[PDB]
Design a protein around this ligand. Structure first.
Ligand SMILES: Cc1cc(C(=O)OCc2cccnc2)n[nH]1
Lengths: 20, 337
């Protein structure tokens, strides 16, 4: 499922901003 | 009238924008309690203002770290904008000052915690719950955009829940007053509009694309474009193929297809009717916009609040002592702060 894929991803924590 | 309310809001903003408040407090007037969050160039701490007993959220930025990250202009924009704005859904800047080492922005303390925390724990929000929050962002962007401000960092991490269960927008680090198009590559990977990724000049329509990402994330429990590496997230965004969970209503999917529109001549919020194309959409049919603005709508969730200065709605962070150098650092760079 997409939820299981999300939960298993490295991007469930606070996401840092990008710049430059 | 909306046009008339915004006209007066612009007058109020412009006076503060052209003559910014500076040096309104000192570090020594506050008792430092706990860190509420951290970032690349500083931290946010719960503090108590001794003279009043009021609690606040103090953002501390290390000037040397700001300089290294080339965020000088972005930090001057943040403080100059924050001291000039006034809206029910924006976290209020109470005081600002600087010392030899750091810049300080003392904000109103929002005790309910980040929407990020609640969304991740709960999993996802119901369409009426997501709608209640989305309406607040619609009105906030309508206000900001009318002042020629682009926000550029919409995400659950930057949205705080107050005691009444309403949103408070924080983090104006990428906010900019701009009349034309802009080019800076900034934001959060999952929330970037394709124009930003493709190094095109862009405008306020990027905030409307980010609203589409937020509404999707709130209602689904995960964002429309995710992957382990930002490059892979960018590939998904530029294709713009979005799949919706089976539980998303027909109205929701249609609103998201118009917000998450790769074509700028077709993106809602960016058309001749502007924000009205969003406010009048079928998914918002039950939303009483005036009542949302006036905070008379009952919130779907009220945070638990044990008492003043309680931090249980915030994660724990490692504490670091605030060191103030005996020598002034980066004085010239931050002269206007
Ligand atoms: C992520 C972030 C938060 C801020 C901030 O200034 O927030 C103020 C705040 C934080 C916690 C509780 N109340 C207000 N800036 N960037």
């Amino acid at each position: 499922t997409t939820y299981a894929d999300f939960i298993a991803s490295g991007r469930t924590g606070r996401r840092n901003a990008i710049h430059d | 009238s909306v046009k008339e309310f915004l006209a007066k809001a612009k007058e109020d903003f412009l006076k503060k924008w052209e003559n910014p408040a500076q040096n309104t407090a000192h570090l020594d007037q506050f008792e430092r309690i706990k860190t509420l969050g951290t970032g690349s160039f500083g931290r946010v701490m719960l503090v108590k203002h001794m003279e009043t007993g009021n609690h606040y959220a103090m953002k501390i930025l290390d000037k040397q770290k700001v300089v290294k990250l080339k965020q000088i202009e972005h930090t001057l924009n943040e403080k100059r904008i924050l001291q000039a704005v006034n809206f029910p859904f924006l976290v209020k800047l109470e005081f600002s000052f600087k010392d030899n080492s750091n810049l300080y922005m003392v904000m109103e303390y929002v005790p309910g915690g980040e929407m990020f925390s609640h969304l991740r724990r709960i999993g996802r929000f119901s369409e009426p719950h997501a709608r209640f929050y989305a309406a607040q962002i619609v009105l906030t962007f309508e206000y900001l955009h009318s002042l020629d401000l682009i926000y550029r960092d919409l995400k659950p991490e930057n949205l705080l829940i107050d005691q009444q269960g309403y949103i408070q927008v924080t983090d104006f680090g990428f906010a900019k007053r701009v009349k034309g198009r802009t080019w800076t590559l900034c934001g959060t990977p999952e929330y970037l509009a394709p124009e930003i990724i493709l190094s095109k000049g862009y405008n306020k329509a990027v905030d409307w694309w980010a609203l589409g990402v937020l509404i999707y994330e709130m209602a689904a429990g995960y964002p429309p474009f995710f992957a382990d590496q930002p490059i892979q997230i960018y590939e998904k965004i530029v294709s713009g193929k979005v799949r919706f969970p089976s539980h998303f209503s027909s109205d929701l999917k249609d609103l998201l297809r118009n917000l998450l529109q790769v074509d700028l001549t077709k993106r809602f919020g960016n058309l001749k009717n502007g924000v009205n194309d969003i406010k009048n959409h079928k998914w918002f049919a039950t939303t009483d916009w005036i009542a949302i603005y006036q905070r008379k709508v009952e919130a779907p969730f009220i945070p638990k609040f044990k008492g003043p200065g309680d931090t249980s709605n915030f994660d724990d962070y490692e504490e670091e002592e605030i060191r103030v150098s005996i020598n002034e650092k980066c004085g010239k760079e931050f002269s206007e702060f």
